[PDB]
Amino acid sequence: AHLTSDDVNLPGSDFFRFYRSADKQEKEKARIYLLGVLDATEGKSWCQYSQLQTVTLQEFVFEFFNKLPAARLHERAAPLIEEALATRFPCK
Amino acid sequence: IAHLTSDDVNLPGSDFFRFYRSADKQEKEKARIYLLGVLDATEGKSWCQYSQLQTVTLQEFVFEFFNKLPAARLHERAAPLIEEALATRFPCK
């Protein structure tokens, strides 16, 4: 019910819940979490920022999580996000 | 950048560290959430690991790393700087 900076190993299912929360404060925190993940991986496992709007990255993360089975949602959020982005925008 | 928001892609070290030290507890908490996204994305991979370490120890080492950073390096991106802080201190293996 609340995303905080102690939530290490954030699971995908909680991330996605906050990410689509009716509470826009939790939505914004989930998106700032996603921002630390993107900034940490961009140009390493997926490419790139001047090729893509942040809204495009957020919508692609949304679609990716929205299609995921619960078996996979229960895994860690960050590697799932990074997987969204890698398959779709690889560096090669 | 007067407030940390999720539009802040490629957040510079200078902005991250300002928010991370802010007197506004809410800005401070957002900066710590940006940090959590970076920890989650890099843990077990460039640095190790969440068991023996509480979040606060991690947060304090990141703070000390930034405090000692030469001014020249604050233009670098916050995420790789946070990763360097943790890799040096909590190397894998």
Author numbering:
A (entry chain B): 32 to 123
B (entry chain A): 31 to 123
Lines quoted from the article behind this entry:
Some Gram-negative bacteria target their competitors by exploiting the type VI secretion system to extrude toxic effector proteins. To prevent self-harm, these bacteria also produce highly specific immunity proteins that neutralize these antagonistic effectors. The opportunistic pathogen Serratia marcescens has recently been shown to utilize T6-dependent secretion of two family 4 amidases, Ssp1 and Ssp2, to mediate antibacterial activity. In S. marcescens, the resistance-associated proteins Rap1a and Rap2a neutralize Ssp1 and Ssp2, respectively.
